[PDB]
């Protein structure tokens, strides 16, 4: 396994947040586990706006292929930033660095949320689980890879709420080779079985890369 | 079992100029599998013939065990049409409607093209791409007769670059959705690919499509 | 001053087939056009307000130095509009404009598809009680091409704001008027509809005002 | 006047960047200025860019309306946050947040910048000017204002840059009822002069809102 330690601080319209955690993963599983607690608080929106926030790192890749996530430790890294549209409006904006130990990656990841409306579901107990995602990953030359997802989550109602989510992953060194001369899309399935509280938080996801199913 | 007759008839405009394509294949539906070739009726193309290849039948892809093909389901009770809209990364848009028609062991797409906005300096009136890439589309029902669907979908240029566009559709259906489909925990995933052999007046595709929960 | 107007307006609003005629008359030196129209398939199965603005930019005030493109390309083989609309409940409107000219009449014909607004839709409720003012950013895409783009919205009846975002592509047969492509900048147009509508029988009066600067 | 101090914050494409400086201005007259410094060396993108990141306090509104904005100084105040996202697929991510004193606003703005290709427009020297926009304004609610508007830049050639921002205007008390009880949208049309190198930034702005332009 690799240690994981993170620490996640933002606003949610306005509202100030902190959640510090940590657990464990296992890339060659494209297995991780991290647990959280809120350290201001119950939280004042659902915490399943956070279990996508809660290390890419922890995927699986084809044969063939190495996980440039992975790959990026011994060679400078990389920083993710999403921008998330919510169907309601509402934004968020995520940057998440890392760094890392023998054995172990921190994650410090800052969050800005801004105009959910008043009625939005997120401040509800509507939600019920985060969905499983599939992400379209291509290369921008040989620093660059950007990312673009659908994700929803249930409802108890049945019906799902749903967002887009953009993203720009800047390595420092150049993304390894087997994910620059591919020359189409890699594909990155995620899910999260997720237990929740609005001031404890946990995560184990699963990560699985793939060029076909 | 086996392998159902396809005709297909494209019309439309792009940047103002019509079209017209008209042709077609057969496709396995166990397999996942169909072929289309068409032949411009108007003249050449003014813009590049895989701008048409994922216009050129949901109805062929494979789904896993447990679930039914939505599309195929339909075929045999009121069926189903669907609306995309494209938005390309230099600014040009194309609106596509699907409509079928069901014959014994045969299908017939008609659909219509407006693709506006394309700038003259767009890759599309290029010779620069040279193939359209897999995608997975994320599909989840809306209510009981429609499914929304979202996809990034990239083409690979000569050069080694890519073009880009995001797709988001919108299938509505006469009946209900096969309860498979409206009874599954979240999104089903559709994975797409195509195998183009094109001129600008003479195209053809083999097209793979596998839906899948989880790969 | 006054040219005569003659619109129909054909489309589908997922998958419902709706047909209205009609006309009115306008005067583009006040900025003013009116228009009254009918449905030929009895009540509509949305708003009617959804329809107000797809009931002519000739009929817009263009500032001093400036002539109104619109008005300007009906003697040099005119211009089409495709609008691309996009609801905030995920519904979408593409909007075609086509038009015919005669000495004193522009002549309308106009095709909607809109797709993808849920059954829960403000649009199958009586809520919207009118469409509000707008502003659009207009600038050319090269000597024959406008883009525009703005936002708009109606009122609710309980106080809110039902919203949606509109990508324009109006492309010209001639070069667009030297004073709009010699301008670099964009022009602004302000529009606003007033409407007094049945379920049955549509009619606006519209007011466009075009400017660099607001006095 | 009222004078204005300002700073910017943020990172474009990862790299850091920060500019201090300030100006002055006129809120009946709908004008104000702002003159800026980089504290790290030459900017690695056009300061073009950041313009429209360098108070919607100055902005004339007509009558019968009250600047909603300059309204907000006294009772608690607004933040502003816009996501701008321009055609080559850049998106800038701006927060705005200002403190007040006698005869002072102080801005305070984080800027992040990521997704611009190497190709960009902003790595050039091509833009020559910002260009004027018209940005729609209405409540969601008593306390909250959504924007939006288009924005191009002309280039050297003759060609236009563009990018759509979406703004959302948080206002700690309500917003004032002139606005609040419009029924319909008020309209912001604003324009820019710029003398800008890659160290010394510098507009003079003008903001006029209207219901209707005449």
Redesign the interface.
Known sequence: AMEIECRITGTL??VEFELVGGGEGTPEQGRMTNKMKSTKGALTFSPYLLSHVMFYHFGTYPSGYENPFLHAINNGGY?N?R?EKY?D?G?L?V?FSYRYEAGRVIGDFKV?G??F??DSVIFTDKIIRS????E?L????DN?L?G???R?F?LRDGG?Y?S?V?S?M?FKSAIHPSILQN???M?A?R?VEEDHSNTELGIVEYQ?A????
């Open positions: 319209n306005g920083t930033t921008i169907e409006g934004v904006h940057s800005m801004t105009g409306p008043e969905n499983a995602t599939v379209h291509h290369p921008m030359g660059d950007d673009s997802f659908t929803t249930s799902y749903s887009v953009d720009h800047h020359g189409g899309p594909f399935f899910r699985h793939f060029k076909t199913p």
